[PDB]
């Protein structure tokens, strides 16, 4: 019959291979992702705490420059970058960690759920590194973290943390240890 292109066949066969092999638990834990509602709540908070784009940064710096020509507190933003976020988790500064599920060299993030479990930081696996990228004005973002916030929504952050630790961490608690996949049947 008709012939499919080669890279499309590679994509679909990589699908079937990654879903129907006996996957180790460290990799099989990434198939369990946040629901729609909890991801929406988390992204509402993280959209409240987005960083500034280049245009806003230059605009603000021009404003301070002309104010000097003619007082501030510490800025609170979503923290990103893999090594930076790992350093924040290790020093117990991060409060909530959101890890993308489609990092192509998956070794860069396999130790991250275990690390968050060890240091005690609440974590959740989200659908899409491109979603985390839009939040930080980049194309993609392997992981984001929130450490501290402004006063007016601290309670909200706390509730969100409790939400994931009641809504994602205990639904993952038993299946985070088990091998995934298989063709038994």
């Amino acid at each position: 019959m008709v012939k499919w292109p080669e890279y499309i066949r590679l994509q679909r066969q990589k699908k079937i291979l990654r879903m129907r092999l006996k996957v180790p638990p460290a990799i099989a834990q990434f198939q369990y992702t946040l629901d729609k509602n909890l991801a929406a709540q988390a992204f509402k908070l993280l959209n409240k705490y987005r960083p500034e784009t280049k245009q806003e940064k230059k605009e603000r710096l021009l404003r301070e420059a002309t104010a000097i020509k003619e007082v501030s507190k510490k800025p609170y933003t979503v923290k990103y970058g893999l090594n930076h976020v790992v350093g924040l988790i290790e020093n117990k500064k991060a409060s909530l960690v959101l890890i993308a599920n489609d990092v192509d060299p998956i070794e860069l993030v396999v130790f991250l759920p275990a690390l968050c479990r060890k240091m005690g930081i609440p974590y959740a696996i989200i659908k899409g590194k491109a979603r985390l990228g839009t939040l930080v004005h980049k194309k993609t973002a392997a992981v984001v973290a929130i450490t501290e916030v402004r006063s007016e929504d601290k309670n909200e952050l706390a509730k969100l943390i409790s939400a994931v630790k009641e809504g994602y961490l205990e639904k993952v608690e038993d299946t985070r240890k088990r091998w995934g996949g298989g063709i038994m049947g």
Partner: protein, 86 residues
């Protein structure tokens, strides 16, 4: 499902069958991550830069001030002025 996909699965699975062990796929026991680390791993001091305003932004702002004083760049106008001008 189909025979070709299952043949591919069986090929890469036979590439990953350890037959010398009774249980090749055991449950993960969290012998390390079950205990919680209460303190940070680093005992290094925090640099004073994390408590004081930014110095790189201070240098950038002074460079901008020097640029405005030479008239090289245009000063700040609030966005409503730019809207009513254009």
């Amino acid at each position: 499902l189909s025979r070709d996909e299952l043949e591919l699965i069986r090929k890469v699975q036979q590439g990953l069958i350890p037959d010398d062990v009774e249980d090749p796929y055991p449950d993960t026991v969290e012998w390390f991550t079950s205990v919680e680390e209460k303190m940070p791993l680093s005992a290094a001091p925090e640099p004073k830069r994390r408590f004081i305003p930014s110095k790189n932004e201070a240098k950038q702002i002074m460079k901008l001030v020097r640029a405005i004083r030479e008239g090289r760049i245009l000063p700040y106008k609030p966005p409503e002025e730019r809207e009513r001008e254009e």
